[PDB]
Amino acid sequence: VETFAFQAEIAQLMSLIINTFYSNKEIFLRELISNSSDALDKIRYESLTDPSKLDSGKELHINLIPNKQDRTLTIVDTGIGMTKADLINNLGTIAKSGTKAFMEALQAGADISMIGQFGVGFYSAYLVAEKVTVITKHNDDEQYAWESSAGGSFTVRTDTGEPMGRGTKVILHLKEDQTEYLEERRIKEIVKKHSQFIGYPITLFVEK
Numbered sequence: 086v087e088t089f090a091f092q093a094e095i096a097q098l099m100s101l102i103i104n105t106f107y108s109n110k111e112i113f114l115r116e117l118i119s120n121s122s123d124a125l126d127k128i129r130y131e132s133l134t135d136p137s138k139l140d141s142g143k144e145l146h147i148n149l150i151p152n153k154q155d156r157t158l159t160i161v162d163t164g165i166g167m168t169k170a171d172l173i174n175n176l177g178t179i180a181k182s183g184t185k186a187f188m189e190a191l192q193a194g195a196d197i198s199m200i201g202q203f204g205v206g207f208y209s210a211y212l213v214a215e216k217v218t219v220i221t222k223h224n225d226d227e228q229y230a231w232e233s234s235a236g237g238s239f240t241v242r243t244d245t246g247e248p249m250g251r252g253t254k255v256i257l258h259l260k261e262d263q264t265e266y267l268e269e270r271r272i273k274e275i276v277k278k279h280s281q282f283i284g285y286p287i288t289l290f291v292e293k
């Protein structure tokens with residue numbers, strides 16, 4: 086297990102998201118689904134030039150999996166996935182610029198719900214989650230687990246769990262007062278409202 090410090094700007098962003106009073110938390114799901122959609126777009130495009138990139142799985146979809154016992158909501162996709170370099174360095178480097186712009190926009194009166202316009206919507210996960218675990222598998226790399234409960238650091242390790250083939254799993258360990266997002270009716274409501282035109286099948290798993 087390797088432990089890393091967040092870019093200073095990203096740490097600041099995470100603290101803002103965790104500490105700011107903002108009741109419209111439901112937008113987190115839209116942002117994560119958007120991330121998945123983008124990842125699916127990417128593997129789909131790449132497969133047009135190199136069909137073998139789908140040897141790791143041809144189905145392009147998104148699964149939403151609530152678990153009341155573990156108090157987790159999991160967003161699963163069969164998108165392009167992320168390499169170790171993506172997880173440790175490269176996405177954070179990109180996120181640095183977006184974070185700065187977002188935090189400046191907020192100071193100018195922008196709304197937290199606009200986070201996606203700045204390319205850092207992933208971090209909206211911390212509106213509802215005390216810990217986020219990201220399991221990911223890219224064609225060119227091994228299966229990794231990224232994890233952070235904020236506080237300025239994150240970890241990355243090779244994943245021992247069951248193989249995914251290709252794609253990403255975002256596991257939200259929900260805050261105690263955010264369990265409404267484990268309810269079928271609530272998730273359906275949010276998907277219908279914010280994600281009705283996503284171009285991939287979204288399957289909401291039922292509990293038990």
Ligand SMILES: Cc1c2c(n3c1CCCN1CCC[C@@H]1CNc1cc-3ccc1C(N)=O)CC(C)(C)CC2=O
Pocket residue numbers: 120121123124127162164165166167171172176177179180204205207219231252253
């Ligand atoms: C930015 C950013 C970040 C993450 N994703 C994106 C967003 C930017 C990177 N994204 C654009 C299209 C495909 C790539 C990789 N795919 C994903 C990226 C993100 C989230 C989900 C997925 C996912 N579900 O595949 C996650 C993490 C690296 C842990 C932290 C972070 O800064």
